[PDB]
Design a protein around this ligand. Structure first.
Ligand SMILES: Nc1nc2c(ncn2[C@@H]2O[C@H](COP(=O)(O)OP(=O)(O)OP(=O)(O)O)[C@@H](O)[C@H]2O)c(=O)[nH]1
Ligand SMILES: Nc1ncnc2c1ncn2[C@@H]1O[C@H](COP(=O)(O)OP(=O)(O)CP(=O)(O)O)[C@@H](O)[C@H]1O
Ligand SMILES: Nc1nc2c(ncn2[C@@H]2O[C@H](COP(=O)(O)OP(=O)(O)O)[C@@H](O)[C@H]2O)c(=O)[nH]1
Ligand SMILES: [Ca+2]
Ligand SMILES: [Ca+2]
Ligand SMILES: [Ca+2]
Ligand SMILES: [Mg+2]
Ligand SMILES: [Mg+2]
Ligand SMILES: [Mg+2]
Lengths: 437, 425, 315, 62
């Protein structure tokens, strides 16, 4: 067994981290006090769930998690939350004043004063690991801490854990829930500085999750609680192979091997189905073919884009529930003849499939209905570059006038880092177009 | 970022600052004696932003009252909420400033400024995480204008990493005390351009027009004008005083509203305008909130473009309908929002409405049309300065004509800077 | 009040559409770079489809189908017909893609033997002169020749596909005729540019419309335009668009697309219709601009943003 | 259409379906960047205090 350490940075990362670990506890049968009766090896063990949980002498199962936020309000709710006993104080790190939606303030000014503390608290967990795989970093693009402090942390992790893998779960900025005008700036800056240090990054556009909640859950004005419960379902589908017995994506390295043929293009598109409202009295349970076909509808993707006008480099189907290989192949055969699925000439046109018989777990009192079978498709398509174009275009509009730039220079940053980061994004868009056309 | 230190200087600053504390003390369930008698924990969740907690669980405003004569401050101490203020935070002189920027900034105010900074320091030392300072003052007088900007400069020297915010009342011949007001205002604007992060331009011309044209007040008094100011001050600070995600602290507000450091002068707006029993609909709030007749600065928004906008809806309403109506204004009037700042309109919602109203909306706009205000002051300034009229009041306090020429040039530069981004594409 | 932007100043068709939209008092034109638009009359090259449908509170529509170039490019059309099982093909001339591929396959068919190469055109009987990206297509050596004149022609049909992928064929077509008699060994290329440079003898501007051409087929051949030609045209239009429908449809997309196409057909002496090419940004006939551009607003624009001359090709 | 590498267990199973074959900076360098930006802050703050100090001198001369 090899351990994984989760790192939650900023408000978005922390609150999403809370939803995930809550979902992890329900799936593994861990109670809010960290006690799991199902575990018979009291005080230790090398089971599959031990990748995300350590065990104490009293039988408490403690997440291998570190929460970080440059201000205390959000993490304080974890200190007094339902799962307060789950964590111990050393895992929760808070400052007093935040980055004010300013990348330079989270990376240079305030980040320099707390980076050593966080690395030290991460070193505490790494010492409890017989064989650490790497890290799962949760953060936003638009926040000053999520963008600024994450880039600095990812730089230092490559120094202290050069052989370990690092996966991201990134929240892409959407004006419908946005809190700052300069989020395009922070997104480009943190992507440029974190690119070479990230092995595989799963982007989640708040726009897509917002509309999925409105369309498929009948929520007029979705809240962060609505968005995060749905995001945690996708994150759980992606990490279930690390927490349960299986043979597909059993360690963080397989994610890079199965989904990332070229390092810079490490942004797989995630698509999830079915999303059913719990308020709905009854719902006709969808078949294997129906949910697999839904993986090719843009309305179910984590980023709104058109994979038909790009090319695939890899595809992974992750089923949970009553699914057998026979139904999957019959669904893939039907879909090949209808959908427009183009692979790059230097990749096999195929799918890696993983099935876990335990159906998806829904938080009681949530908005998602229980389903007998669900799927999450991870496909590395060049169409996701549409999100980089949207982001870079907004960056170009503001930076041409140097709007808000003085806020970053005032924190010690140089204007040159803006154009340096934008030029790296211009190359990234070019890499996608070479592969996709 | 939790504590804000309030400062009110001069006649206008203290009469307006006093009404501000009366309004928000009612919204936070604090009585004139500082005791809490509210019915919602949302009132006390962010009470430490503007109040200190005393011994017997009393709440003392974190406010400092400044003036060069005791006249107005004695009226505050005798006012309804006068007992709530910390007695030691009353710092006042005797000689007065005679509506003279020089007296407040260089002579009379210099004698008193160190005493004020001692009270500021005493209040800042007990702050867990000081956001910065907010100042209420006029620009047309002497104390609030001259000593006010002196305080801002000396506070920035001692707290250069804190946010400086002001509510600045702009003079107008319609509500004018002396003819030297354009002098005092031009000199102060230059100071504000350099040493503040956020300035709400409250124009006495607009307040009078609103009282006369809209509220049908034949003879508006300063009390009638201050009802509009108190209501606007409550709205623009709602996001600071109640739990929320958008513009919840002074620095994040500055990052969202100030694309260029010198262009930090905001046009406030409020709806509905009061001096009624029918509650307004969300479409009505949005239309009036953006109407020129609701702007507290006498500028036509259609003559300029919006760099950034902050909107605050208060009360119990459909947050979906709020999102819809806000998108409607932007999509129907896209030309008046600069296209080179995407998504420059941010909206917040608070469930607690102000007193007397079930629904309210507050507008905070950074429009290039604010240049019309500075143009107006500059024309009044130059009309007298081309003949050196009334300058002896200032040269007698040690000032040189060169300092006036510099202030005139600096404000004309500010006007040109606003015009740059009004035609920028 | 709806909003739209214009990003193709050279579009004679949509210059009239934007003129008609403003004339209704319910459409406001924004700056070309204003993102808060309902309709986009986009450019021909590098249209930013990825930035569409991301404006909350704005139903956005664009006058181009992303991916339609597969049908409106010479080499792409050949590749599409040969590789698509639903097209396999009796109505498309035998063609081959040649780079300066299927060259050895083109010579196998070479062993009537007159061809044509295009992408500057070259018609030759010997293949060596042709080879000395392009597509080599079989030249129709026996075209239907109009009389009096003994001359060549081609038919242009305008097709409108709306956001629901309804296929609308404009009633009025046009025959871009040659004014010179066809010689087997200017009379071969019926382009309006090549003919305008004996022009305008039989019909005005070498443009014969359907009323005159239908009367000719009745008097000269004892048949109608509908039966002899139009049935094959509607079949070809439907087959081409229904083939690419799964790849370009915006049915479940965050933005909607429509597009006006220009199909160019050739008729042989046996009254058989052949497809020549499909144009993605076509122009209209002068006397037909008014009726067609109004039909675009009613069927493609006003259907999405509310305020017959078409034949609906049902699926 | 081939199905390969079928692994089964009690929790589930996995496999691969093919439809067609194919045709860092050091800690020192980081600390330099962080401290180089910190010095640009101190410089800008010192230029401000220098500017404010010149204003204090003007207040005396008046
Ligand atoms: N999905 C989701 N997005 C969030 C959540 N919280 C914040 N965001 C998004 O993240 C962006 C803002 O960044 P934050 O994470 O809130 O800021 P931060 O990391 O705390 O950094 P600071 O600027 O120092 O406060 C916006 O685009 C928000 O919409 C959340 O709980 N769930
Ligand atoms: N296989 C073929 N057989 C007979 N004639 C042909 C032919 N291919 C082309 N032609 C003739 O050459 C002319 C030009 O062909 P083509 O349409 O490919 O060029 P083009 O695209 O520049 C004109 P447009 O864009 O208006 O259709 C046609 O009108 C036709 O008369
Ligand atoms: N709105 C408002 N404006 C005032 C009030 N008192 C004075 N002013 C304005 O402020 C200017 C005079 O400044 P004032 O505050 O009286 O001088 P100071 O005491 O030396 O600061 C004039 O332009 C007045 O119109 C008031 O109570 N309300
Ligand atoms: Ca165990
Ligand atoms: Ca004295
Ligand atoms: Ca002292
Ligand atoms: Mg935060
Ligand atoms: Mg006075
Ligand atoms: Mg053509």
């Amino acid at each position: 067994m090899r351990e994984c350490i989760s790192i939650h940075v900023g408000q978005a990362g922390v609150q999403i981290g809370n939803a995930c670990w809550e979902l992890y506890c329900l799936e593994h049968g861990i109670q809010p006090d960290g006690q799991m009766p199902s575990d018979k090896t009291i005080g230790g063990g090398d089971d599959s769930f031990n990748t995300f949980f350590s065990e104490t002498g009293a039988g408490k199962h403690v997440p291998r998690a570190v929460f970080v936020d440059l201000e205390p309000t959000v993490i304080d709710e974890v200190r007094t939350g339902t799962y307060r006993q789950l964590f111990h104080p050393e895992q929760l790190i808070t400052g007093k004043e935040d980055a004010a939606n300013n990348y330079a303030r989270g990376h240079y000014t305030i980040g320099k004063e707390i980076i050593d503390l966080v690395l030290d608290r991460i070193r505490k967990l790494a010492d409890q690991c017989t064989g650490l795989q790497g890290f799962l970093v949760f953060h936003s693009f638009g926040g000053g801490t999520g963008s600024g402090f994450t880039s600095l942390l990812m730089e230092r992790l490559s120094v202290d854990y050069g052989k370990k893998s690092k996966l991201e779960f990134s929240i892409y900025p959407a004006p419908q829930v946005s809190t700052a005008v300069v989020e395009p700036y922070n997104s480009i800056l943190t992507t440029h500085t974190t690119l070479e240090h990230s092995d595989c990054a799963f982007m989640v556009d708040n726009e897509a999750i917002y509309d999925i909640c409105r369309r498929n859950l009948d929520i007029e004005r979705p809240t962060y609680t609505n968005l995060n419960r749905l995001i945690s379902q996708i994150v759980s589908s992606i990490t279930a192979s690390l927490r349960f017995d299986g043979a597909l994506n059993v360690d963080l390295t397989e994610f890079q091997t199965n989904l990332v043929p070229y390092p810079r293009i490490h942004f797989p598109l995630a698509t999830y189905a079915p999303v059913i409202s719990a308020e709905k009295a009854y719902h006709e349970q969808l078949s294997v073919a129906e949910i697999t076909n839904a993986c090719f509808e843009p309305a179910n993707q984590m980023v709104k884009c058109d994979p038909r006008h790009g090319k695939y480099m890899a595809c992974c189907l992750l089923y949970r529930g009553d699914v057998v290989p026979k139904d999957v192949n019959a669904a893939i055969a039907t879909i090949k003849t209808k959908r427009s699925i183009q692979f790059v000439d230097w990749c096999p046109t195929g799918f890696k499939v993983g099935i876990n018989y335990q159906p998806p777990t829904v938080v009681p009192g949530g908005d998602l209905a229980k389903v007998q079978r669900a799927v999450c498709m991870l496909s590395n398509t060049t169409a996701i570059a549409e999100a980089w174009a949207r982001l870079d275009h907004k960056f170009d509009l503001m930076y041409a006038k140097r709007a808000f730039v003085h806020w970053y220079v005032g924190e010690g940053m140089e204007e040159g880092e803006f154009s340096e980061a934008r030029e790296d994004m211009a190359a990234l868009e070019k890499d996608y177009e070479e592969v996709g056309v | 970022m939790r504590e804000i230190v309030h400062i009110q200087a001069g006649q206008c600053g203290n009469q307006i600052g006093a009404k501000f504390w009366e309004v928000i003390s009612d919204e936070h369930g604090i009585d004139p004696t500082g005791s809490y008698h509210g019915d919602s924990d949302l009132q006390l969740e962010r009470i430490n932003v503007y109040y200190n907690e005393a011994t017997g669980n009393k709440y003392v405003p974190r406010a400092i009252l400044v003036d060069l004569e005791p006249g107005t401050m004695d009226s505050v101490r005798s006012g309804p909420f006068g007992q709530i203020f910390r007695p030691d935070n009353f710092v006042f002189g005797q000689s007065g400033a005679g509506n003279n920027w020089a007296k407040g900034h260089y002579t009379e105010g210099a004698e008193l400024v160190d005493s004020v900074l001692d009270v500021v320091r005493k209040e800042s030392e007990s702050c867990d995480c000081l956001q910065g300072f907010q100042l209420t003052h006029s620009l047309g007088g002497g104390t609030g204008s001259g000593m006010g900007t002196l305080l801002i400069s000396k506070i920035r020297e001692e707290y250069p990493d804190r946010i400086m915010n002001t509510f600045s009342v702009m003079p107008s011949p319609k509500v004018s005390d002396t003819v030297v007001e354009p002098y005092n205002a031009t000199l102060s604007v230059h100071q504000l351009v350099e040493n503040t992060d956020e300035t709400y331009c409250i124009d006495n011309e607009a307040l009078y027009d609103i009282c006369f044209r809209t509220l049908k007040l034949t003879t508006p008094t300063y009390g009638d004008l201050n009802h509009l100011v108190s209501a606007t001050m409550s709205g623009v600070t709602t996001c600071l005083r109640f739990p929320g995600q958008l513009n919840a602290d002074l620095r994040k507000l500055a990052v969202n509203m100030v694309p260029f450091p010198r262009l930090h002068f905001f046009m406030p707006g409020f709806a509905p305008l009061t001096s009624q029993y029918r509650a307004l609909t969300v479409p009505e709030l949005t239309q009036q909130m953006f109407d020129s007749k609701n702007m507290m600065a006498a500028c036509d928004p259609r003559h300029g473009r919006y760099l950034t906008v902050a909107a605050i809806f208060r009360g119990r309403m459909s947050m979906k309908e709020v999102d819809e109506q806000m998108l409607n204004v932007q999509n129907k009037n896209s030309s008046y929002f600069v296209e080179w700042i995407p998504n420059n309109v941010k909206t917040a919602v608070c469930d607690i409405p102000p007193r007397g109203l079930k629904m309210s909306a507050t507008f905070i706009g950074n429009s290039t049309a604010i240049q019309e205000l500075f143009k107006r002051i500059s024309e009044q300034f130059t009309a007298m300065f081309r003949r050196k009229a009334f300058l002896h009041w200032y040269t007698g306090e040690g000032m040189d004509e060169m300092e006036f020429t510099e202030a005139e040039s600096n404000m004309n530069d500010l006007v040109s800077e606003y015009q740059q981004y009004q035609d920028a594409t | 009040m709806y909003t739209f932007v214009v990003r193709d100043e050279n579009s004679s068709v949509y210059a009239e559409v934007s003129r008609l939209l403003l004339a209704t008092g319910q459409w406001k034109r924004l700056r070309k770079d204003n993102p808060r638009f309902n309709l986009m009359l986009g450019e021909r090259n590098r249209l930013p489809f990825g930035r569409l449908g991301h404006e909350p509170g704005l139903v956005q529509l664009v006058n181009y189908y992303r991916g339609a170039d597969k049908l409106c490019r010479k080499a792409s059309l050949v590749k599409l017909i040969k590789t698509s099982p639903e097209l396999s093909c009796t109505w498309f001339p035998e063609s081959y893609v040649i780079y300066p591929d299927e060259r050895e396959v083109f010579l196998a068919a070479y062993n009537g033997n007159v061809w044509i190469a295009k992408s500057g055109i070259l018609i030759s009987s010997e293949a060596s002169e042709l080879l000395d990206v392009h597509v080599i297509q079989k030249y129709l050596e026996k075209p239907l020749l109009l009389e009096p004149g003994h001359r060549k022609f081609d038919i242009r049909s305008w097709v409108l596909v709306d956001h629901l992928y309804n296929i609308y064929l404009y009633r009025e077509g046009v025959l871009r005729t040659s004014s010179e008699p066809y010689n087997s060994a200017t009379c071969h290329l019926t382009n309006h540019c090549i003919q305008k440079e004996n022009y305008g003898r039989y019909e005005e501007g070498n443009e014969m419309f359907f009323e005159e051409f239908n009367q000719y087929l009745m008097d000269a051949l004892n048949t109608t335009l509908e039966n002899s030609i139009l049935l094959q045209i509607k079949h070809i239009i439907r087959s081409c668009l229904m083939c690419i429908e799964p790849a370009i449809s915006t049915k479940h997309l965050h933005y909607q697309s429509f597009q006006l196409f220009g199909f160019d057909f050739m008729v042989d002496e046996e009254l058989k219709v052949w497809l020549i090419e499909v144009n993605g940004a076509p122009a209209c006939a002068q006397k037909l601009y008014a009726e067609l551009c109004q039909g675009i607003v009613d069927v493609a624009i006003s259907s999405v943003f509310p305020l017959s001359i078409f034949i609906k090709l049902h699926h | 259409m081939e199905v390969i590498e079928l692994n089964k267990c009690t929790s589930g199973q996995s496999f691969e379906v093919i439809l067609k074959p194919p045709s860092d900076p050091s800690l020192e360098e980081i600390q330099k960047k962080l401290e180089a930006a910190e010095e640009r802050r101190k410089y800008q703050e010192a230029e401000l205090l220098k500017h404010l100090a010149e204003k204090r001198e003007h207040e005396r001369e008046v």
